[PDB]
Write a protein that binds this ligand. Structure first.
Ligand SMILES: [Mg+2]
Ligand SMILES: [Mg+2]
Ligand SMILES: [Mg+2]
Ligand SMILES: [Mg+2]
Ligand SMILES: [Zn+2]
Lengths: 229, 36, 146, 95
RNA sequence: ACGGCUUUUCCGGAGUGUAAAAAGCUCCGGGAAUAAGGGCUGGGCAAGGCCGGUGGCAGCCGCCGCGGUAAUACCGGCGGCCC
RNA sequence: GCCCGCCGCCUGGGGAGUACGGCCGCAAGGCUGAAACUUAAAGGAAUUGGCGGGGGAGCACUACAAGGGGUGGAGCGUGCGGU
RNA sequence: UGGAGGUGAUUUAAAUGCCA
C-alpha cells in the first residue's frame, strides 16, 4: 500500500484549490475520510477525495460497465455521441457512480471516471441472515429495498460463503463495496443496465435509512466504512 | 355488437361503422339465405 | 380497484372458484386438457414417421431473400395424409426418386411451427432407403436400392 | 460475330400473352405449349418487362406445360435484327 | 530425438470359484506393446481480422440474421475451443 | 398516496365479435360465445429533425411589381438525341 | 406568471411516384 501513500505527497503539493473545502483539506485540519460526509458539505473539486482515498485510482477499484452509442439527426446527416457507465470505490466500504458523455470513447471514459468520483458515498454492513449468526461484515445487515425507473429490488442477508447471486451487471458494483453474499428478488425490466445500476446503488444508499437502536448494534456487527485494517 | 374499442384507431385499417354495416348485409343473409 | 376479492377468512370456496375460472383464459392450459394438439396432427403426436414420395417441386422464400428451395411430397402410411417434406444438404435432390420410402422428423422452431425463410413447411428428411442423409450430403456412403 | 443471346442449351423464347400478375408471366413459345414463367429479383429491379417483350427462359422437369425463368430480355436494337439472319420467325406473334 | 522403468488392459498357463460351467480373483510366462470420436469455430456464448473455391447462384438460419466479384456468417483446407 | 371490505372483467395479434346451439323481440336486432390455421410483433409516453393546400419574424432582378432588350417562327455555325 | 373554458367566424379547380 506504499504507492497509495506516495500519491499523497505527489498530489498535495501540486494543486491549489479553487473552492473552500479544498483548503480545509489542504491545510491539515481534516485529514480523515470518514469525517467529511455526515455534515452536508459540497464536493466540487475531485482531488479532495484522492488526497484522502488515494486507492480509488488503482485500476482495480475502478470498473467499466458498458459503452453505448446514441444518435440524433440534423438536416446534414447524423450526429453521434457515446455514453459509458462507470463506477468506482475502494474495496472496503465506499462507492460512487457516474455516467458522463462525450464524442469519443476515451474522453467519455475519462469524463465519467471523474464524475463518479464525487457522488461517492458510504455504507453499513453486517451479518444477520438466519444462518450466519457470526459477527463479521460479509453480508448486508437487514433486508432493504430501493426503487428507480421501473425496477424495484430488495436485498436479503445470507450465509458466509454463498457466492454473489444477482444479475451480471450487478455482480461488479456489489463486488466493489465487497458485499459478498446476498440474495436477490427482482421486478421490472433488467435490460436497461443504467436503471439497474442506479436502483441497486440507491438501495445500498438506503442501507443507512433505518434506525437501529443502541443494543442491536451488537447483534449484527454493523460497521461504518473501514473495519479492522 | 359487443364492441371492442381497439379497432376504431383507423391506423392500418378502415373505419368501423362502415364495416359493421357490411357485416349486417351478410348475417341478414346467412340467416335468410336458405338457412331455414 | 380496491384491496382484493375474497380476502376474508372463510370464503375460500369462492376463492377456489375464482382461480378455477380465471385459469382458463390462458392458452397453454387449454391446448392441453382438450388435447387439441392431438387429432389435428398429421402424425398423431409422435417424434417420427415413414412415407412414400409423390412428386418433386420447388418453393420460394420469404420477402427479403432469393432462391428456390427444393421440396417433396410424401404420402404417409399411418393415416393416408399427404404432407410436405423439405430436404437439406446441397443438391441432395439428386437422389430422391419417385417412390422411395423415406423418414420424416420435425423442424423444431417457434411453437413447433416452421422456421427461417421457408415459412410454409413443417417437415424435413433424415433417412432414405434406411440410409442417414447426412452421409449422402458428403457422400461417404453408397446407396442401396439404386 | 455479335452478342445476340442465342438460346443456349435449352433456353426458350417467350413472347407474352399477358402478365397473369405479380411475377406470374403467361408466356408463349413456338412449341404449342402456353407457359407460366417466373421472375428473379435481379431484373424485377433494374429493368422493365411488358407484353410483346421477348425474353429467354428455361424449364424444370415438371409438367412440360408451364415453366420458365427470365435471364435476359431482348433489345430493340436487335429485336428485329435477329430476324434478318432468320433466328426468330414472326408467325408466333401475328395470327 | 534418444536412454531407464511399468504391466492395470491384451495374448498364453496353473490354482480357486461353480449344481455343471462361465466370469471374476491370488500367481506365473510374454511384451509400450492391445486401446479416440463427437460438436462447434459472425452477437447471444468459450473460441481464426488464416489461407483456397462460389456469384441475390447454389446454401446456412433454435431468434436477430449473411450471399451483389474483396464473404471472420456457404463450400472446402489449414489452424483453434468445449465435453 | 398509506391502510381495512365485497364485486365484475383481462392474460400476444387476426381469422372474430364470424361460426354452430339456446334464450327474449312483431321487425330491425339485441344478450351467451368458441376452433382450425396464419404471423414476430402489433399498441403506450415522451426526443431531435423534415414537412404542413398550419401561424408569426425576414429576404433575393437567377422572385414578383415598374421599366429596357429579346429567344420561340426563317437560313446557317456549333453541341446533344436517334438511325 | 401560464392557461383554463365559451361565441362566432375560418376560401374556386390542384389525382399519383421503380432500383439497391
Ligand atoms: Mg383498451
Ligand atoms: Mg469455415
Ligand atoms: Mg468471446
Ligand atoms: Mg373548392
Ligand atoms: Zn457474518
Amino acid at each position: 500500500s506504499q504507492e497509495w501513500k506516495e500519491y499523497a505527497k505527489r498530489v498535495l503539493d501540486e494543486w491549489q484549490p479553487k473552492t473552500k473545502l479544498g483548503m480545509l483539506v489542504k491545510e491539515g485540519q481534516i485529514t480523515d475520510i470518514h469525517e467529511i460526509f455526515r455534515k452536508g458539505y459540497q464536493i466540487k473539486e475531485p482531488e479532495i477525495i484522492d488526497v484522502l482515498l488515494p486507492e480509488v485510482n488503482a485500476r482495480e477499484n475502478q470498473e467499466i460497465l458498458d459503452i453505448a452509442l446514441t444518435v440524433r439527426m440534423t438536416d446534414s446527416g447524423r450526429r453521434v455521441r457515446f455514453r459509458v457507465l462507470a463506477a468506482v470505490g475502494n474495496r472496503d466500504g465506499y462507492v460512487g457512480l457516474g455516467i458522463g458523455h462525450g464524442r469519443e470513447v476515451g474522453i467519455a471514459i475519462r469524463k465519467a471516471i471523474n464524475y463518479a468520483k464525487l457522488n461517492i458515498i458510504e455504507i453499513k454492513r453486517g451479518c444477520g441472515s438466519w444462518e450466519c449468526r457470526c459477527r463479521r461484515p460479509h453480508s448486508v445487515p437487514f433486508t432493504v429495498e430501493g426503487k428507480e425507473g421501473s425496477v424495484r429490488v430488495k436485498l436479503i442477508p445470507g450465509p458466509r460463503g454463498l457466492g454473489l447471486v444477482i444479475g451480471d451487471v450487478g455482480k461488479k458494483i456489489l463486488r466493489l463495496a465487497g458485499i459478498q453474499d446476498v440474495w436477490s428478488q427482482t421486478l421490472g425490466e433488467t435490460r436497461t443496465t443504467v436503471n439497474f445500476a442506479k436502483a441497486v446503488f440507491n438501495a445500498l444508499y438506503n442501507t443507512n435509512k433505518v434506525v437501529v437502536t443502541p443494543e442491536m448494534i451488537e447483534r449484527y456487527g454493523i460497521v461504518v466504512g473501514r473495519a479492522m485494517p | 355488437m359487443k364492441r371492442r374499442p381497439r379497432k376504431w384507431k383507423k391506423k392500418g385499417r378502415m373505419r368501423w361503422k362502415w364495416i359493421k354495416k357490411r357485416i349486417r348485409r351478410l348475417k341478414r343473409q346467412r340467416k335468410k339465405e336458405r338457412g331455414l | 380497484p380496491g384491496k382484493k376479492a375474497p380476502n376474508g377468512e372463510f370464503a375460500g370456496r369462492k376463492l377456489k372458484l375464482k382461480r378455477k375460472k380465471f385459469r382458463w383464459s390462458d392458452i397453454r392450459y387449454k391446448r392441453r386438457v382438450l388435447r387439441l394438439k392431438e387429432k389435428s396432427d398429421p402424425l398423431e403426436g409422435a417424434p417420427q414417421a415413414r412415407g412414400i414420395v409423390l412428386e418433386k417441386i420447388a418453393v420460394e422464400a420469404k420477402q427479403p431473400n432469393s432462391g428456390m428451395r427444393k421440396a417433396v411430397r410424401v404420402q404417409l402410411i399411418k393415416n393416408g395424409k399427404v404432407v410436405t417434406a423439405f430436404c437439406p444438404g446441397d443438391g441432395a435432390i439428386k437422389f430422391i426418386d419417385e417412390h422411395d420410402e423415406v423418414i420424416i422428423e420435425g423442424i423444431g422452431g417457434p411453437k413447433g411451427g416452421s422456421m427461417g425463410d421457408i415459412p410454409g413447411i413443417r417437415y424435413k428428411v433424415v433417412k432414405v432407403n434406411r440410409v442417414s442423409l447426412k452421409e449422402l450430403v458428403k457422400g461417404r456412403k453408397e446407396k442401396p436400392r439404386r | 460475330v455479335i452478342r445476340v443471346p442465342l438460346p443456349e442449351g435449352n433456353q426458350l423464347f417467350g413472347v407474352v400473352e399477358q402478365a397473369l400478375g405479380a411475377g406470374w408471366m403467361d408466356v408463349r413459345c413456338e412449341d404449342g405449349k402456353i407457359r407460366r414463367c417466373r421472375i428473379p429479383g435481379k431484373l424485377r429491379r433494374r429493368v422493365w418487362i411488358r407484353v410483346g417483350d421477348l425474353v429467354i427462359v428455361q424449364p424444370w422437369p415438371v409438367q412440360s406445360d408451364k415453366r420458365g425463368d427470365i435471364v435476359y430480355r431482348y433489345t430493340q436494337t436487335q429485336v428485329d435484327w435477329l430476324l434478318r439472319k432468320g433466328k426468330i420467325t414472326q408467325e408466333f406473334l401475328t395470327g
